[PDB]
Design a protein around this ligand. Structure first.
Ligand SMILES: [Mg+2]
Length: 44
RNA sequence: CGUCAAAGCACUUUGCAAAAGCUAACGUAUCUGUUUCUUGCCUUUUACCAGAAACAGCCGUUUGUAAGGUGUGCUAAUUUGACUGUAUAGUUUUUGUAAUCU
């Protein structure tokens, strides 16, 4: 109907294996990782 | 060419589905549009300039399959596939050095 209403980007992208899917974040331990990263930045 | 098998066959209309897997012309051809950037010309918008990225559209192509049409056939025609396919008594196999007994 209009130029900007034409079909475009018909394929929705999903997070892949290494991009941080729900499974990987659920398996991961975010608390300890956050603590190590905070300590590492403090070290500088 | 031959044997066997199943399929009517040749041309054609329409529907449905698919088309890179091992780097490669579905198309030895070739247009347009949108978004986000960087540019050109620029008094403001459309229309624009010419490069990129990500997306789409249109003109076409191929294959499979389903249902039909035309012309010829089923008192045969053609097509597709498969095949460990050929002679021959005259020494290297299939027209017998056999029987005899031990
Ligand atoms: Mg004004």
């Amino acid at each position: 109907t209009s130029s900007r209403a034409l079909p475009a980007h018909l394929k929705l992208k999903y997070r892949q294996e290494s991009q941080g899917t729900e499974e990987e974040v659920r398996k991961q331990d975010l608390r300890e990782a956050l603590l190590r990263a905070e300590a590492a930045h403090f070290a500088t």
